[PDB]
Design a protein around this ligand. Sequence first.
Ligand SMILES: Nc1nc2c(ncn2[C@@H]2O[C@H](COP(=O)(O)OP(=O)(O)O)[C@@H](O)[C@H]2O)c(=O)[nH]1
Length: 407
Amino acid sequence: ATVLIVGRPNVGKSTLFNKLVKDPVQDTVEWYGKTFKLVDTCGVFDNPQDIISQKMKEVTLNMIREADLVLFVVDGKRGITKEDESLADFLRKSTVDTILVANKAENLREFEREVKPELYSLGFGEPIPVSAEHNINLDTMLETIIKKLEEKGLDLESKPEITDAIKVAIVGRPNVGKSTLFNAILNKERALVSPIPVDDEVFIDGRKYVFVDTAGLEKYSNYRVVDSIEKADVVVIVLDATQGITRQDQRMAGLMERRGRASVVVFNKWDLVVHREKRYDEFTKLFREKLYFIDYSPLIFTSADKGWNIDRMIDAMNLAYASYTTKVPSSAINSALQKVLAFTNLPRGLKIFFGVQVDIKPPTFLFFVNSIEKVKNPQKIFLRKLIRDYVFPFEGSPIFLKFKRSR
Ligand SMILES: Nc1nc2c(ncn2[C@@H]2O[C@H](COP(=O)(O)OP(=O)(O)O)[C@@H](O)[C@H]2O)c(=O)[nH]1
């Protein structure tokens, strides 16, 4: 389920957001084991009456309709303003279920006397008085949100069930420990080579995986490496911690990123590294400087020989795949974009109007801009980073960008 916080500037949306999720514009709220996604839409829907284009109005309406519920926040001390009225009109038009929340209403007696009456004119019934800053009545509001979501038949308890097998490729230079690592996985009770009558179907934790080109688990073509990367969803690149990161490792990483595969980076033979426990920062910096191409990848320190961190490697593959298949609300993408652009000046005459996610495997976003030629590498790095920083980290997954010229 997804809940959107809507409201004009300075009504306390950020404070309310931070209080509910316990800065990003999207996060999760937990309630007695039940959860839902929360999005502070910031100013994405401000001045809706100023949208001239019918297409743009329809796109904006679809953004709000992504929500199962909207928390329409107004200022309980100041009262109704023209901006609250325009937002109210847009929300009513959208027909999306909405809860009117009057923040800054700690002084209940004054609120009901001076402001509550006028709030009825917004068309959403009686407002729920709360105080995000003083943590007042937030529990009653939450209970109300949960009830409404459940009444709509939404499941706030079960985590989405995966249907496809997760294809994994284990790659790396000869002798780094690929074969040993693959067998280390198979030796654990949580894994099992499918008993059901060049790949291997493997079950781990009750989930289905396909480890590609397992036959291997002088060199000239490396056709298997390229083929394996293409076939996989998640690619585990294994490095020999005693050797560091070679140029060939960098080439494989570049290939992984260009093909848009999820990934996990493993420093194996960690047991052979001297004074190893005092060198995590050193190796992490090496990973960041040599493999920045795929720095979104979890970095696991393993010993395939001693059986160190095989579990962390498996969990990392699961996390990478989860990010690889994650979809985020367009309201969140645009809320983040507008929040950052507020204090960011784009070069040349570049303008980035809005964006939306258009695919997964890998997560791919389309941004509408005034000029495609004005979008250079720094702006692409900038867009991927704001998504990771404010929307969802997408740990383990690359983020692809597409652009469309518009006026
Ligand atoms: N000390 C140590 N030896 C390892 C480790 N992983 C693999 N090895 C050894 O190093 C060699 C390379 O292993 P291999 O698994 O055949 O990797 P491959 O060519 O990547 O598939 C073998 O002699 C292994 O026993 C590790 O984590 N620690």
